PDB file of all heavy atoms in Angstrom:
ATOM      1  N   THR B 420      29.073  13.866  15.292  1.00 28.28           N
ATOM      2  CA  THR B 420      27.841  13.534  14.536  1.00 28.28           C
ATOM      3  C   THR B 420      26.683  13.917  15.418  1.00 28.28           C
ATOM      4  O   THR B 420      26.736  13.941  16.683  1.00 28.28           O
ATOM      5  CB  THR B 420      27.672  12.160  13.973  1.00 28.28           C
ATOM      6  OG1 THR B 420      28.325  11.270  15.008  1.00 28.28           O
ATOM      7  CG2 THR B 420      28.509  12.031  12.687  1.00 28.28           C
ATOM      8  N   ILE B 421      25.382  14.182  14.829  1.00 24.92           N
ATOM      9  CA  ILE B 421      24.203  14.280  15.404  1.00 24.92           C
ATOM     10  C   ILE B 421      23.243  13.271  14.993  1.00 24.92           C
ATOM     11  O   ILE B 421      23.281  12.825  13.851  1.00 24.92           O
ATOM     12  CB  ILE B 421      23.737  15.670  15.319  1.00 24.92           C
ATOM     13  CG1 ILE B 421      22.575  15.961  16.190  1.00 24.92           C
ATOM     14  CG2 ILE B 421      23.394  15.997  13.810  1.00 24.92           C
ATOM     15  CD1 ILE B 421      22.094  17.426  16.284  1.00 24.92           C
ATOM     16  N   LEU B 422      22.417  12.815  15.908  1.00 27.59           N
ATOM     17  CA  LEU B 422      21.442  11.742  15.576  1.00 27.59           C
ATOM     18  C   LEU B 422      20.233  12.241  14.830  1.00 27.59           C
ATOM     19  O   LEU B 422      19.424  12.985  15.595  1.00 27.59           O
ATOM     20  CB  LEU B 422      21.111  10.983  16.872  1.00 27.59           C
ATOM     21  CG  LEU B 422      22.108   9.956  17.562  1.00 27.59           C
ATOM     22  CD1 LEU B 422      21.575   9.433  18.754  1.00 27.59           C
ATOM     23  CD2 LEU B 422      22.278   8.891  16.575  1.00 27.59           C
ATOM     24  N   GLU B 423      20.293  12.052  13.574  1.00 27.58           N
ATOM     25  CA  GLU B 423      19.116  12.671  12.749  1.00 27.58           C
ATOM     26  C   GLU B 423      19.055  11.705  11.494  1.00 27.58           C
ATOM     27  O   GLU B 423      19.945  11.649  10.788  1.00 27.58           O
ATOM     28  CB  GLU B 423      19.295  14.101  12.370  1.00 27.58           C
ATOM     29  CG  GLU B 423      18.039  14.894  12.138  1.00 27.58           C
ATOM     30  CD  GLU B 423      16.858  14.599  12.988  1.00 27.58           C
ATOM     31  OE1 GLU B 423      17.060  14.053  14.186  1.00 27.58           O
ATOM     32  OE2 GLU B 423      15.685  14.974  12.719  1.00 27.58           O
ATOM     33  N   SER B 424      17.912  11.077  11.279  1.00 33.34           N
ATOM     34  CA  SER B 424      17.660  10.272  10.208  1.00 33.34           C
ATOM     35  C   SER B 424      17.561  11.038   8.879  1.00 33.34           C
ATOM     36  O   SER B 424      16.989  12.209   9.049  1.00 33.34           O
ATOM     37  CB  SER B 424      16.530   9.381  10.363  1.00 33.34           C
ATOM     38  OG  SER B 424      16.513   8.535  11.516  1.00 33.34           O
ATOM     39  N   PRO B 425      18.102  10.605   7.726  1.00 32.76           N
ATOM     40  CA  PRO B 425      18.927   9.382   7.558  1.00 32.76           C
ATOM     41  C   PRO B 425      20.417   9.585   7.684  1.00 32.76           C
ATOM     42  O   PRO B 425      21.193   8.837   7.146  1.00 32.76           O
ATOM     43  CB  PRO B 425      18.412   8.969   6.187  1.00 32.76           C
ATOM     44  CG  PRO B 425      18.156  10.349   5.516  1.00 32.76           C
ATOM     45  CD  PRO B 425      17.902  11.249   6.544  1.00 32.76           C
ATOM     46  N   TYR B 426      20.716  10.696   8.363  1.00 33.59           N
ATOM     47  CA  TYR B 426      22.173  10.989   8.302  1.00 33.59           C
ATOM     48  C   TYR B 426      22.947  10.080   9.367  1.00 33.59           C
ATOM     49  O   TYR B 426      23.850   9.327   9.031  1.00 33.59           O
ATOM     50  CB  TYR B 426      22.441  12.452   8.694  1.00 33.59           C
ATOM     51  CG  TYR B 426      21.634  13.414   7.888  1.00 33.59           C
ATOM     52  CD1 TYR B 426      20.395  13.889   8.381  1.00 33.59           C
ATOM     53  CD2 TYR B 426      22.045  13.771   6.632  1.00 33.59           C
ATOM     54  CE1 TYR B 426      19.616  14.871   7.652  1.00 33.59           C
ATOM     55  CE2 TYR B 426      21.283  14.688   5.700  1.00 33.59           C
ATOM     56  CZ  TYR B 426      20.167  15.180   6.330  1.00 33.59           C
ATOM     57  OH  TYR B 426      19.390  16.036   5.580  1.00 33.59           O
ATOM     58  N   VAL B 427      22.617  10.157  10.562  1.00 31.36           N
ATOM     59  CA  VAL B 427      22.995   9.173  11.599  1.00 31.36           C
ATOM     60  C   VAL B 427      21.988   8.623  12.444  1.00 31.36           C
ATOM     61  O   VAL B 427      21.150   9.382  13.029  1.00 31.36           O
ATOM     62  CB  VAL B 427      24.015   9.997  12.518  1.00 31.36           C
ATOM     63  CG1 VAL B 427      24.567   8.943  13.614  1.00 31.36           C
ATOM     64  CG2 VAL B 427      25.264  10.612  11.926  1.00 31.36           C
ATOM     65  N   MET B 428      21.711   7.427  12.398  1.00 30.70           N
ATOM     66  CA  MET B 428      20.707   6.700  13.177  1.00 30.70           C
ATOM     67  C   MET B 428      21.209   5.610  13.883  1.00 30.70           C
ATOM     68  O   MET B 428      22.362   4.904  13.528  1.00 30.70           O
ATOM     69  CB  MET B 428      19.523   6.159  12.292  1.00 30.70           C
ATOM     70  CG  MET B 428      19.352   7.069  10.933  1.00 30.70           C
ATOM     71  SD  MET B 428      18.518   6.187   9.652  1.00 30.70           S
ATOM     72  CE  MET B 428      19.978   5.453   8.774  1.00 30.70           C
ATOM     73  N   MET B 429      20.708   5.076  14.949  1.00 32.72           N
ATOM     74  CA  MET B 429      20.974   3.945  15.716  1.00 32.72           C
ATOM     75  C   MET B 429      20.612   2.588  14.941  1.00 32.72           C
ATOM     76  O   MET B 429      19.649   2.526  14.151  1.00 32.72           O
ATOM     77  CB  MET B 429      20.387   3.936  17.066  1.00 32.72           C
ATOM     78  CG  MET B 429      20.939   4.718  18.313  1.00 32.72           C
ATOM     79  SD  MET B 429      22.834   5.012  18.349  1.00 32.72           S
ATOM     80  CE  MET B 429      23.479   3.378  17.893  1.00 32.72           C
ATOM     81  N   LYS B 430      21.469   1.613  15.162  1.00 32.50           N
ATOM     82  CA  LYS B 430      21.120   0.258  14.538  1.00 32.50           C
ATOM     83  C   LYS B 430      20.213  -0.508  15.389  1.00 32.50           C
ATOM     84  O   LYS B 430      19.883  -0.179  16.603  1.00 32.50           O
ATOM     85  CB  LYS B 430      22.460  -0.503  14.414  1.00 32.50           C
ATOM     86  CG  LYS B 430      23.120  -0.092  12.991  1.00 32.50           C
ATOM     87  CD  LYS B 430      24.087  -1.303  12.607  1.00 32.50           C
ATOM     88  CE  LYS B 430      24.916  -0.902  11.412  1.00 32.50           C
ATOM     89  NZ  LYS B 430      26.115  -1.664  11.207  1.00 32.50           N
ATOM     90  N   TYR B 442      26.741   3.000  14.385  1.00 44.70           N
ATOM     91  CA  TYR B 442      25.908   3.983  13.632  1.00 44.70           C
ATOM     92  C   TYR B 442      25.981   3.723  12.143  1.00 44.70           C
ATOM     93  O   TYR B 442      26.999   3.233  11.646  1.00 44.70           O
ATOM     94  CB  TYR B 442      26.517   5.381  13.863  1.00 44.70           C
ATOM     95  CG  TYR B 442      26.752   5.676  15.251  1.00 44.70           C
ATOM     96  CD1 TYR B 442      28.170   5.858  15.804  1.00 44.70           C
ATOM     97  CD2 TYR B 442      25.767   5.827  16.337  1.00 44.70           C
ATOM     98  CE1 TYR B 442      28.416   6.128  17.055  1.00 44.70           C
ATOM     99  CE2 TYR B 442      26.169   6.068  17.602  1.00 44.70           C
ATOM    100  CZ  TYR B 442      27.468   6.243  17.957  1.00 44.70           C
ATOM    101  OH  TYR B 442      27.824   6.565  19.283  1.00 44.70           O
ATOM    102  N   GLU B 443      24.862   3.961  11.466  1.00 43.05           N
ATOM    103  CA  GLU B 443      24.778   3.746   9.958  1.00 43.05           C
ATOM    104  C   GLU B 443      23.907   5.005   9.565  1.00 43.05           C
ATOM    105  O   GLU B 443      23.003   5.490  10.193  1.00 43.05           O
ATOM    106  CB  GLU B 443      24.047   2.373   9.584  1.00 43.05           C
ATOM    107  CG  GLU B 443      22.794   2.214  10.228  1.00 43.05           C
ATOM    108  CD  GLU B 443      21.802   1.609   9.326  1.00 43.05           C
ATOM    109  OE1 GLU B 443      22.279   1.054   8.274  1.00 43.05           O
ATOM    110  OE2 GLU B 443      20.525   1.595   9.621  1.00 43.05           O
ATOM    111  N   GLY B 444      24.263   5.442   8.246  1.00 43.30           N
ATOM    112  CA  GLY B 444      23.533   6.574   7.702  1.00 43.30           C
ATOM    113  C   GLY B 444      24.446   7.217   6.567  1.00 43.30           C
ATOM    114  O   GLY B 444      25.431   6.705   6.356  1.00 43.30           O
ATOM    115  N   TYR B 445      23.801   8.274   6.113  1.00 43.63           N
ATOM    116  CA  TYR B 445      24.505   9.066   5.039  1.00 43.63           C
ATOM    117  C   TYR B 445      25.919   9.595   5.623  1.00 43.63           C
ATOM    118  O   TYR B 445      26.890   9.579   4.913  1.00 43.63           O
ATOM    119  CB  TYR B 445      23.625  10.207   4.501  1.00 43.63           C
ATOM    120  CG  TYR B 445      24.171  11.101   3.426  1.00 43.63           C
ATOM    121  CD1 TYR B 445      23.782  10.803   2.061  1.00 43.63           C
ATOM    122  CD2 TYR B 445      24.969  12.048   3.792  1.00 43.63           C
ATOM    123  CE1 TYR B 445      24.276  11.615   1.151  1.00 43.63           C
ATOM    124  CE2 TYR B 445      25.487  12.965   2.784  1.00 43.63           C
ATOM    125  CZ  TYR B 445      25.136  12.684   1.425  1.00 43.63           C
ATOM    126  OH  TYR B 445      25.685  13.489   0.415  1.00 43.63           O
TER     127      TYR B 445
ATOM    128  N   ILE C 497      31.076  15.959  10.649  1.00 44.60           N
ATOM    129  CA  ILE C 497      30.410  15.488   9.507  1.00 44.60           C
ATOM    130  C   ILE C 497      29.033  15.198   9.720  1.00 44.60           C
ATOM    131  O   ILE C 497      28.487  14.149  10.292  1.00 44.60           O
ATOM    132  CB  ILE C 497      31.151  14.187   8.976  1.00 44.60           C
ATOM    133  CG1 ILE C 497      32.537  14.403   8.548  1.00 44.60           C
ATOM    134  CG2 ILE C 497      30.452  13.683   7.641  1.00 44.60           C
ATOM    135  CD1 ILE C 497      33.374  13.445   7.840  1.00 44.60           C
ATOM    136  N   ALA C 498      28.233  16.105   9.595  1.00 46.59           N
ATOM    137  CA  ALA C 498      26.774  16.174   9.996  1.00 46.59           C
ATOM    138  C   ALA C 498      25.962  17.182   9.272  1.00 46.59           C
ATOM    139  O   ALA C 498      26.518  18.034   8.476  1.00 46.59           O
ATOM    140  CB  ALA C 498      26.596  16.478  11.430  1.00 46.59           C
ATOM    141  N   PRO C 499      24.616  17.231   9.204  1.00 47.75           N
ATOM    142  CA  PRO C 499      23.798  18.264   8.536  1.00 47.75           C
ATOM    143  C   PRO C 499      24.048  19.652   9.281  1.00 47.75           C
ATOM    144  O   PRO C 499      23.124  20.074   9.984  1.00 47.75           O
ATOM    145  CB  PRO C 499      22.388  17.698   8.632  1.00 47.75           C
ATOM    146  CG  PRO C 499      22.338  16.727   9.801  1.00 47.75           C
ATOM    147  CD  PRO C 499      23.780  16.062   9.762  1.00 47.75           C
ATOM    148  N   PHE C 516      28.320  19.464   0.288  1.00 55.01           N
ATOM    149  CA  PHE C 516      28.123  18.259  -0.181  1.00 55.01           C
ATOM    150  C   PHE C 516      26.708  17.891  -0.511  1.00 55.01           C
ATOM    151  O   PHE C 516      26.332  16.889  -1.198  1.00 55.01           O
ATOM    152  CB  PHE C 516      28.660  17.150   0.638  1.00 55.01           C
ATOM    153  CG  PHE C 516      28.110  17.022   2.085  1.00 55.01           C
ATOM    154  CD1 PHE C 516      26.852  16.312   2.291  1.00 55.01           C
ATOM    155  CD2 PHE C 516      28.610  17.750   3.003  1.00 55.01           C
ATOM    156  CE1 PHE C 516      26.272  16.261   3.513  1.00 55.01           C
ATOM    157  CE2 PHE C 516      28.117  17.769   4.311  1.00 55.01           C
ATOM    158  CZ  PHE C 516      26.940  17.072   4.493  1.00 55.01           C
ATOM    159  N   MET C 517      25.726  18.778  -0.078  1.00 57.78           N
ATOM    160  CA  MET C 517      24.286  18.470  -0.431  1.00 57.78           C
ATOM    161  C   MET C 517      23.628  19.755  -0.236  1.00 57.78           C
ATOM    162  O   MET C 517      23.600  20.498   0.799  1.00 57.78           O
ATOM    163  CB  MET C 517      23.673  17.458   0.602  1.00 57.78           C
ATOM    164  CG  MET C 517      22.255  17.006   0.210  1.00 57.78           C
ATOM    165  SD  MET C 517      21.540  16.163   1.588  1.00 57.78           S
ATOM    166  CE  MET C 517      22.824  15.414   2.429  1.00 57.78           C
TER     167      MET C 517
END
Side-chain angles (χ1 to χ4, degrees):
Chain B
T420 36
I421 190 168
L422 283 176
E423 208 38 20
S424 304
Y426 310 100
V427 182
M428 334 156 265
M429 272 338 310
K430 275 197 180 167
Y442 317 111
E443 55 143 12
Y445 181 98
Chain C
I497 300 196
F516 60 87
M517 191 195 328

